């Protein structure tokens, strides 16, 4: 299946090699490839599909959180969450928003 | 020392100190005499097989075969008898008085039928969660068997117009009333059926779509004693007040998850409220304004429920702890603006108080649960 | 407390000592009176009517079976577990099943 893809595609991320686009947040830089967070984020496609570079460095605002920001790409990868009530307010919109998000 | 010389009044005495289980399966293989102790209209007018699964599908031939005063049939989450197993018993039913069968899915309009035209008599008819219950043999049921003293309906969605009609217009005994979820339950079958009995004092329509129109001509009867009004379509506020200011009698007042209902009735209800003893306030939009005139304005309470309130005075709280003399309900639940003193001082300040803390209710739980 | 949490989760997962019964499409949870009290509004107005030892509670046909497993685990534990493939009936973090206006 794809998802055997998706997981491949995941395995190689955690290996920081074969990454593609580098997400900054005040200096953590998380590595993960180009077409995934195009399809994921839609904050993400605007930045992207507009360029045909190699390395890329796409940096995101105050309003996205790290801590919601880490299992955000992990169900974009896997769909699979974990999270407690207390970090939860950051995150409730349930049609993933969170990022502009005028749909 | 002779058990058998004891006359027999003393043995079933004795006997009736048994589960069905212990006396039909121990005490019945002693000897003869307890075998035919352990058999009787004493012990077999009292049926309740309620949740004896795949055990009763065609033995209801020999529980009434020639018991001759089963009274209290109780079949309730029966999963194994059909229609057939259930008529066949029907067909005598002498002197049936509270036939009771919850969530008995497999059970039928058929069932209603035997049972309803070959027992003139009935007390209570407290059926549940049976599905396919068309109103067709209700009709019958109110028509045939005028007696009855008691109903349940609670989540049977075909009982929409025609049935309340037709138990109320023979019917006129009936006591008390309990209704779900029901939809298509239109208000022009209840304001008819408002003049002829004003004995009843339970009184429920839950989840229901009953409107305040026959609501507000509730002031013509003067004995009604407990209300389930809960999520009703705007009642009349006058009316309420009326009830609470004439019917000195009145037991219970629930009138939960109501939006449209303000913080006035609340206000009053404590200006001349002496015999209101519970309140069920849960999720109410409370403007933590009426505390003050509870507590001082109210000497005679004894049950409060605080639901999920936002926001709460924990001085005010703890004013109305010592206020009263014997008021110590405080079953608090997800209480976020609540500090670490009374749960932490009022346990042991009080130790006639229950609470419901979740950090306090998990090992009394386990502890009651390992004695018991 | 968090102990007692778990330990109130691992004797709801032993089906013994249960108070509360959900009766939803014939199946049937068996958890406690006073965690259900806690998590949705909507039961904690259908219980504490009622001093009954045992009680009864049935739900919408809105409300789905799949969507409803998990929501116990999540009163139980707290926890926030979720697939990508049953996500829309629970859109609104106050879980939203169907009718469901706490």
């Known amino acids: ?103 | 020392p002779d058990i058998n010389q004891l006359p027999p009044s003393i043995l079933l005495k004795i006997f009736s100190n048994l589960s069905l289980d212990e006396r039909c399966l121990s005490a019945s293989l002693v000897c003869k005499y307890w075998r035919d102790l352990c058999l009787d209209f004493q012990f077999w007018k009292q049926l309740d097989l309620s949740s004896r699964q795949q055990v009763t599908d065609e033995l209801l031939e020999k529980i009434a075969s020639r018991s001759q005063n089963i009274i209290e049939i109780n079949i309730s989450d029966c999963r194994s008898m059909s229609d057939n197993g259930v008529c066949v018993l029907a067909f005598k039913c002498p002197g049936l008085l509270r036939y009771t069968a919850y969530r008995c899915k497999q059970l039928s309009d058929t069932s209603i039928i035997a049972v309803a035209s070959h027992c003139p008599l009935l007390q209570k008819v407290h059926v549940g969660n049976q599905d396919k219950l068309t109103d067709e043999g209700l009709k019958q049921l109110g028509s045939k068997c005028r007696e009855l003293k008691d109903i349940h309906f609670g989540q049977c969605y075909k009982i929409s117009d025609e049935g309340m009609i037709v138990i109320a217009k023979g019917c006129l005994k009936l006591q008390r009333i309990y209704m779900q979820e029901n939809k298509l339950v239109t208000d022009q079958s209840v304001k008819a059926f408002a003049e002829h009995c004003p004995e009843l004092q339970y009184v429920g329509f839950m989840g229901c779509s009953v409107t305040s129109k026959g609501v507000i001509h509730l002031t013509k009867l003067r004995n009604l004693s407990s209300l389930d009004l809960r999520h009703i379509t705007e009642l009349d506020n006058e009316t309420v007040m009326e009830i609470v200011k004439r019917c000195k009698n009145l037991s219970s007042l629930n009138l939960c998850l109501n939006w449209i209902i303000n913080d006035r009735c609340v206000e009053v209800i404590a200006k001349e409220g002496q015999n209101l003893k519970e309140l069920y306030l849960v999720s109410c939009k409370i403007t933590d304004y009426a505390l003050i005139a509870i507590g001082r304005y109210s000497m005679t309470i004894e049950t409060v429920d605080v639901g999920w309130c936002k926001e709460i005075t924990d001085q005010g709280a703890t004013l109305i702890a010592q206020s009263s003399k014997s008021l110590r309900y405080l079953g608090l639940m997800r209480c976020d603006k609540v500090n670490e003193v009374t749960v932490e001082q009022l346990v042991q300040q009080y130790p006639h108080i229950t609470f419901s803390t979740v950090l306090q209710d998990c090992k009394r739980t386990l502890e009651r649960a390992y004695q018991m």
């Open chain 1, 1 to 103: 299946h794809s998802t055997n893809v998706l997981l491949s595609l995941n395995d190689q991320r955690k290996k920081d090699v074969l990454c593609d686009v580098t997400i900054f947040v005040e200096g953590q830089r998380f590595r993960a490839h180009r077409s995934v967070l195009a399809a994921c984020s839609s904050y993400f496609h605007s930045r992207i599909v507009g360029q045909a570079d190699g390395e890329l460095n796409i940096t995101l605002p105050e309003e996205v959180t790290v801590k919601g920001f880490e299992p955000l790409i992990q169900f974009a990868y896997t769909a699979k969450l974990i999270l407690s009530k207390e970090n939860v307010d950051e995150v409730c919109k349930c049609v993933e928003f969170l990022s502009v998000h005028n749909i």
